[PDB]
Design a protein around this nucleic acid. Structure first.
Ligand SMILES: [K+]
Ligand SMILES: [K+]
Ligand SMILES: [K+]
Ligand SMILES: [Mg+2]
Ligand SMILES: [Mg+2]
Ligand SMILES: [Mg+2]
Ligand SMILES: [Mg+2]
Ligand SMILES: [Mg+2]
Ligand SMILES: [Mg+2]
Ligand SMILES: [Mg+2]
Lengths: 87, 135, 80, 200
RNA sequence: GAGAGUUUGAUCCUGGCUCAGGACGAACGCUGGCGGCGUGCCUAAUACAUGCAAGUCGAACGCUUCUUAAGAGGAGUGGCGGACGGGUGAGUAACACGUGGGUAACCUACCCAUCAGAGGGGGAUAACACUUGGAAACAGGUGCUAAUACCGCAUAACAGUUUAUGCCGCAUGGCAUAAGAGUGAAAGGCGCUGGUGUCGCUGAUGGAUGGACCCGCGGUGCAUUAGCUAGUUGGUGAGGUAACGGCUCACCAAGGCCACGAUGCAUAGCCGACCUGAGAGGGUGAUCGGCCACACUGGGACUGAGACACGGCCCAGACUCCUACGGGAGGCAGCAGUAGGGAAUCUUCGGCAAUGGACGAAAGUCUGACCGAGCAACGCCGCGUGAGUGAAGAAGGUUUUCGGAUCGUAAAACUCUGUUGUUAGAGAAGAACAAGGACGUUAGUAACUGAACGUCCCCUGACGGUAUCUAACCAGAAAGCCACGGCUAACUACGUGCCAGCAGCCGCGGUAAUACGUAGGUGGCAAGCGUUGUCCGGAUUUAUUGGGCGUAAAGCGAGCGCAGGCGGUUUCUUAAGUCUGAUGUGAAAGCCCCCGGCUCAACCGGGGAGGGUCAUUGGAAACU
């Protein structure tokens, strides 16, 4: 399935993540179509960067995020906008 | 040359080659072929240990060993230093390098590796010739 | 070894059923071809039975819809 | 790696007082060894180049690879003169900052203070004597370590400090106030010879 | 875009050899404190002992065992996944790869959006009970039984096809509408109160996603390899595939490829990228990512949306294993690990806490992917191995012109410190969650559960009581390697006497060796140093950039001429070359520039830039 998930980067014991649009068939780090932001919890809070337009376009086109990405997009208000646009 | 000539036949470089072809080849007992492998060192079995007379400006008894390699190429090497534990059938390790005295010796023997005993009572240039520290 | 035994068994049963149903389809079609060669008036109903088997094999995953269409078109050109 | 060996030996090979004192050249201004005082023969341009390079890395107690990389990072600059920028980047090392501020008598003492952690930058400990320093920062002795008598002696025995620095004794904090300058550095060195050396 | 040494009695040319630098998945030797980050069978795609790597669903189905009708466990059937992930690079000189395009010759489970529909019936089967099979895995026989398993019956074609129009395209043709003829679908579970909501079920479209095919161009050596092909080349039919077409068969014809290198032989995965270089270029294709190919060797299919399938089936072959000797079983180029080969390159470790994936309504189960840890100085980075004062200068080593000189402020001594180390306490982040307990909003509702969305409560760490911070203490436990005739920075003494030995090149050694060996001393590097091997450069030493042929290497012994290469002036024309605007793409990572975080640095992350003898369109045309 087409999905919106996050891939691992940075050194060991100091992680970092890029939100990415990946099929479930591809690897954790491998094929992707588009990057729409990035993430790390290494701050005292979590810290986030996002590309609302493209991520909402993929969600419309049929994407299916993971749980933690759903949490992030909730905090950033994208899931709510997608819901509204479907209403 | 004209450019037409250089297209009809291009510049074909001066072919190069090694100062140690014996190290740049290998052997698999299954298919029994020279496998081309760039190996810095090799193992061998001394098939003879002897002395040779060097070229004209010099005069000495230079200690050599004829050796049977892992890759079944038989090779003449030099026994550097002063003294050796070597005999026929003595396992030995070989490195590259000419000995400008005799022509037919493109190789050297390594000390402190295998059955080759470390040099005795060599305190300077000691890693070379392979003998542990005097404490 | 690793839970593939069940897929061996089910795949063999599927092989049995699918080959049976394809053979049924092919016998229907061959019967219709021989009927068109013999000129009998049963051609009208054999045409429909052949089309029936073709589409019922397009269903159940024996026949791709394009193969079904090509078969129906060949039979149509035979009849008409 | 760090050099634990004699200071004067190096200084009198090179033929220069590194500490600016003199007694690393006084009474014996000739290269070490029992072929020292006798008539040294001619010396080569490669020798001069190497000697200039060794002056600097023996001042700053540095390693060859650190030296080379710092040279390359100076080469990456276009806004000035090459070896002068090299010397400036040497000056921006806590080993030398501690020395120029008068907080220690020698660069070895300074490096030891830095690494043992008696020093701060903007109020944060630093055990890294190679730590680069930008113009505007604030070096500061650790407020617990201000009680050691060594540093107080070294600070109250201070001659007039350089022009490119600011510093207070009660606060024991100072900083650079300039790039800093070239001519205010040791003009005994010819940086062009290092440039030719590493142009090779 | 730095050169140096070396032919000679000496000189200049020519010409080669070697050195000065950078880089290894490196190895050997000597030595060896720590931390961080990364890398680690290049050889035998050699053989595999052992253990673990793909399971999941009881909210699809019927049994069985334990629960006082509850939940939990065993084997069933069924569905989904097993085709991804992971490994390797043998084969492959070709649409395999890269790039640019095309598919009016195509397919696509899961995910989205839409139009619809989901009716009524049937016959079995495992499991289970007995039976024989006897070591028992196996296997067969009789009987009973459920399903979202299977069958066919009912209706729709919105699918496809043909006709009639219209429209358009690049011919074949494609799009919209209408009509005609014939065909086909299904499944229910959970919850609420017949109506239902949710998850699933069937048909059609569209999108996304990935896949399949086709074309231009490009990238390796040999002509001591000049011919090659016969379903080969094309056509008319037919068959066949998801689809085009010799993909296949018949029939008709004899064509087709090539000196612009076909065919054959050898070699090789290709690429982004990596090393070097002034660049042009060269060399490599390890780690990371992409495409391809393979799974003991060869072949073939089934299942399925998807394979001709690493951990699936059948057969042949090789190879091995267990047997009660009747018969079975297997395939590490998955992670560890063994043997062997080798110059040589890892623990038969922990956890799913994270991230990702399968399944499931969900908890959750699985996951040698992955997170981590471990070994290796294999590499890059960083800090150490104390610091200040301390003399015309302790002794001792070496040397001496016997006066002294040097090891040497080095030491001893006194003052200070605790990076580090030892000890004792404190002790992060990485964690977001999901589900569950609560509320609230939307559009669906006959109405509530319920779905989507938001806000609180709740609980989750292998690493690890590690990072990290604090305090007590000891200078105390922590430096070696190579070289020293010149090229090349660095000099004396003794022994040896063309012997021992050194040696990258020139060359040292034959009784006074700055070249051997030792001692002292110095120089270059530094937890590394040196050496071999490989690549680049210097090497303009294959010269496009950027060389030459009177004597150094080289003008064929000379001519006639096919092919090709080149070609007088000039009008008009074109626009293949050329020049040029715009648009697209050239993935990410990496190089480079600006930023920012790791006590700085390596490293990590963000943003940008650039990269194509690249492609479409649009102009000029001076020159070819
Ligand atoms: K290959
Ligand atoms: K094969
Ligand atoms: K010597
Ligand atoms: Mg060059
Ligand atoms: Mg396997
Ligand atoms: Mg010299
Ligand atoms: Mg030597
Ligand atoms: Mg002598
Ligand atoms: Mg000649
Ligand atoms: Mg890129």
């Amino acid at each position: 399935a087409v999905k919106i998930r996050l891939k691992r980067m940075g050194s060991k014991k100091s992680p970092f993540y890029r939100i990415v649009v990946a099929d479930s068939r591809s690897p954790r780090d491998g094929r992707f179509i588009e990057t729409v932001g990035t993430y790390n919890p290494l701050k005292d809070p979590a810290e986030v960067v996002l590309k609302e337009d493209l991520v909402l376009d993929w969600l419309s086109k049929g994407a299916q995020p993971s749980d933690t990405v759903r949490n992030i997009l909730s905090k950033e208000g994208v899931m709510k906008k997608h819901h509204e646009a479907k209403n | 040359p004209t450019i037409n000539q250089l297209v009809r036949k291009p510049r074909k470089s001066k072919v190069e080659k090694s100062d140690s072809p014996a190290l740049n080849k290998g052997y698999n007992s299954f298919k029994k072929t020279q496998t081309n492998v760039n190996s810095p060192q090799k193992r061998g079995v001394c098939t003879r240990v002897g002395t040779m007379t060097p070229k004209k400006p010099n005069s000495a008894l230079r200690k050599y060993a004829r050796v049977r390699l892992s890759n079944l190429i038989e090779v003449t090497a030099y026994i550097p230093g002063i003294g050796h534990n070597l005999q026929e059938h003595s396992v030995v390790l070989l490195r590259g390098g000419r000995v400008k005295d005799l022509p037919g010796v493109r190789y050297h023997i390594v000390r402190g590796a295998l059955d080759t005993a470390g040099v005795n009572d060599r305190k300077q240039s000691r890693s070379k010739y392979g003998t542990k520290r005097p404490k | 070894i690793e839970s593939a035994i069940k897929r061996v068994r089910t795949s063999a049963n599927a092989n049995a059923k699918n080959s049976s149903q394809t053979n049924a389809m092919r016998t229907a079609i061959k019967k219709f071809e021989e009927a068109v060669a013999a000129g009998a008036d049963n051609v009208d109903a054999l045409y429909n039975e052949a089309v029936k088997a073709v589409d019922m094999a397009a269903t159940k995953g024996l026949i791709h819809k394009n193969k079904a269409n090509r078969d129906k078109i060949r039979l149509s050109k035979l009849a008409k | 790696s760090r050099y634990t060996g004699p200071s004067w030996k190096v200084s009198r090979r090179l033929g220069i007082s590194l500490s600016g004192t003199g007694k690393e050249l006084a009474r014996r201004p000739y290269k070490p060894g029992q072929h020292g005082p006798n008539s040294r023969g001619k010396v080569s341009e490669y020798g001069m180049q190497l000697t200039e390079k060794q002056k600097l890395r023996h001042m700053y107690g540095m390693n060859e690879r650190q030296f080379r990389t710092l040279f390359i990072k100076a080469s990456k600059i276009k806004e000035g003169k090459h070896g002068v920028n090299f010397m400036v980047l040497l000056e921006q090392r806590l080993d030398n900052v501690v020395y120029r501020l008068g907080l220690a008598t020698t660069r070895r003492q300074a490096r030891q203070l830095v690494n043992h952690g008696h020093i701060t930058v903007d109020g944060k400990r630093v055990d890294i004597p190679s730590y680069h320093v930008e113009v505007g920062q604030v070096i500061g002795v650790r407020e617990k370590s201000q009680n050691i008598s060594t540093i107080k002696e070294a600070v109250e025995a201070t001659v007039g400090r350089p022009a490119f620095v600011s510093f207070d004794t009660e606060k024991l904090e100072g900083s650079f106030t300039r790039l800093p300058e070239r001519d205010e550095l040791y003009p005994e060195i010819d940086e062009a010879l290092v440039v030719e050396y590493y142009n090779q």
